[PDB]
From Swiss-Prot:
It comes from Plasmodium vivax (strain Salvador I). Residues 1-405 are lumenal. GO terms for molecular function: aspartic-type endopeptidase activity. It comes from the Eukaryota. It is not clear if the zymogen has a cleavable propeptide. Cleavage of the putative propeptide is dispensable for catalytic activity. GO terms for biological process: proteolysis. The gene is PMV. Belongs to the peptidase A1 family. This is Plasmepsin V. Disulfide bonds join 47-129, 50-53, 74-85, 79-90, 177-395, 266-311, 320-356. Component of a complex composed of SPC25 and PMV; the interaction is mediated via the transmembrane domains. The complex interacts with the SEC61 channel-forming translocon complex and is involved in the recognition and import of PEXEL motif-containing proteins into the ER for subsequent export.
Length: 405
């Protein structure tokens, strides 16, 4: 019966493409919506005075209205934390892409995290004021970013470490439970009541060791479709467990192999004989990569056709199906040959009435288990034991219209 603090998350894959929560900053409190991002480590948002910032769901944080704010000025041009001194202030600088940056300056102020059961944790945090935004930050609704990764020695103390340092009544575990609409962040553990009820093995958390000290990487040892490992050339692959990534990003070879079969399962018109015939004629020999379970490929194809599970291709050739039924499970191979089921209700996401593929090619050799891997499971960050746990779950769902103010 570990004590759990719970926080509502809002968002989705299609419209927001991230999930966010509300945090109170300053004195008196200014409530700010923040993207929940296990792939970064800062806490930042536009501040009043920014000359090139997007319009977000809240006004920029106003330093002049918070009595507890303290701008981090340079003392004879020297900043802590190896920061750069720019125009008298210690500079905040982040590359949202490989080469492009949000910039501003650092300040500290009080942060207050309140659970929806009215349980409060408060501390001071060194935060970034955006004074220049660009690209997607000019049209994102959320006001800032809440980085959930770990503190490094001699680095700026991060939100997650400060939260637990100031809540010793909690075990040092946080869980993210993403649903199709909204979700929940849990501090202090995971909630076994959310777990979906061989079958007893699927009701149990599967744990993987993190492969880096201060970032949430795990090693993936294979990825199966129709019983066939589609990355057999690679026998370990460090993937970032990243709630700030809309989609799941995989190596190019693996993507092309998977996408080949998803293309076969994507039929625009079930009454077009040429299109249907071409697919039903394919044999095990038709494939560059033969399948170990060709009969399961056939069952998927035949049931998609028989149930008229029509597919529409949208921008960039992404496949969208009318129904989840018929699409295959994928399996992620972890330690000790464990096959973690990755279901269509996770890797496909809701777009209008259809279910669209949420798997993409990596860029810059950055493979990512993103929100289409989080969806409909508890993802459990045990920072005490440096492990991440996974279990299928019925996550809380919160429409954005339920968000106060
Ligand atoms: C996958 N993915 C993330 N997981 N997160 C980022 C992000 C998530 C999101 F939901 C919306 C917009 C985004 F920029 C923030 N990124 C950073 N990557 C490394 C270090 C710092 C940042 C960063 C950049 C800008 C700010 Cl102000 C704060 C932090 C990289 C970018 C990204 O592509
Ligand atoms: C994951 O990490 C844990 C923790 O380091 C490993 O368990 C340790 O294993 C060593 C040697 O087997 C023992 O001396 C330690 O006492 C163990 N630690 C704990 C806390 O039990 C575990 O082996 C790792 N898992 C894999 C698959 O490598
Ligand atoms: C805050 O107040 C200071 C001094 O009163 C002023 O220099 C600064 O421009 C103010 N900031 C904004 C955003 O108005
Ligand atoms: C398809 O071919 C592969 C070749 O590696 C084989 O392993 C598999 O059993 C075959 N399945 C059939 C013929 O149904």
């Amino acid at each position: 019966k570990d004590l759990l603090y719970k926080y509502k998350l809002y968002g989705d894959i299609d419209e927001y493409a991230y999930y966010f929560l509300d945090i109170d900053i300053g004195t008196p409190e200014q409530r700010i919506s923040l993207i929940l991002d296990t792939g970064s480590s800062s806490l930042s948002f536009p501040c009043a005075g920014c000359k090139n910032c997007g319009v977000h769901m809240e006004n920029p944080f106003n330093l002049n209205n918070s009595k507890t704010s303290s701008i981090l000025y340079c003392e004879n041009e020297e900043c802590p934390f190896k920061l750069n001194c720019v125009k008298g202030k210690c500079e905040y600088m982040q590359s949202y892409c490989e080469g492009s940056q949000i910039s501003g300056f650092y300040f500290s102020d009080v942060v207050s995290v309140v659970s929806y059961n009215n349980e409060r944790v408060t501390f001071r945090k060194l935060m970034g004021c955006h004074m220049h935004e660009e690209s997607l930050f000019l049209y994102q609704q959320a006001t800032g970013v809440l980085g959930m990764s770990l503190s490094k020695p001699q680095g700026i103390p991060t939100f997650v470490n400060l939260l637990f340092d100031n809540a010793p009544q909690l075990k040092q575990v946080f869980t993210i439970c993403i649903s199709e609409n909204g979700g929940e962040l849990i501090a202090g553990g995971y909630d076994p009541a959310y777990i979906v009820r061989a079958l007893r093995e699927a009701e149990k958390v599967v744990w993987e060791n993190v492969t880096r000290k201060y970032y949430y990487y795990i090693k993936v040892r294979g990825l199966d479709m129709f019983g066939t490992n589609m990355m057999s050339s690679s026998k370990g692959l460090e993937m970032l467990v990243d709630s700030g990534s809309t989609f799941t990003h995989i190596p190019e070879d693996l993507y092309n192999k998977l996408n080949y079969f998803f293309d076969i399962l994507c039929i625009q018109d079930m009454n077009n004989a040429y299109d249907v015939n071409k697919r039903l004629k394919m044999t095990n020999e038709s494939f560059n990569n033969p399948l170990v379970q060709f009969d399961d490929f056939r069952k998927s194809l035949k049931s998609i056709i028989a149930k008229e599970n029509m597919c529409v291709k949208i921008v960039d050739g992404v496949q969208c199906w009318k129904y989840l039924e018929g699409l295959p499970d994928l399996f992620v191979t972890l330690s000790n040959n464990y096959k973690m089921k990755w279901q269509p209700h996770s890797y496909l996401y809701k777009k209008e009435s259809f279910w669209c593929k949420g798997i993409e090619k990596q860029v810059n050799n950055k493979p990512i288990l993103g929100l289409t891997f989080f969806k409909n499971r508890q993802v459990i960050f045990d920072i005490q034991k440096n492990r991440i746990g996974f279990v299928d779950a019925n996550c809380p769902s919160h429409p954005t219209h339920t968000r106060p103010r």
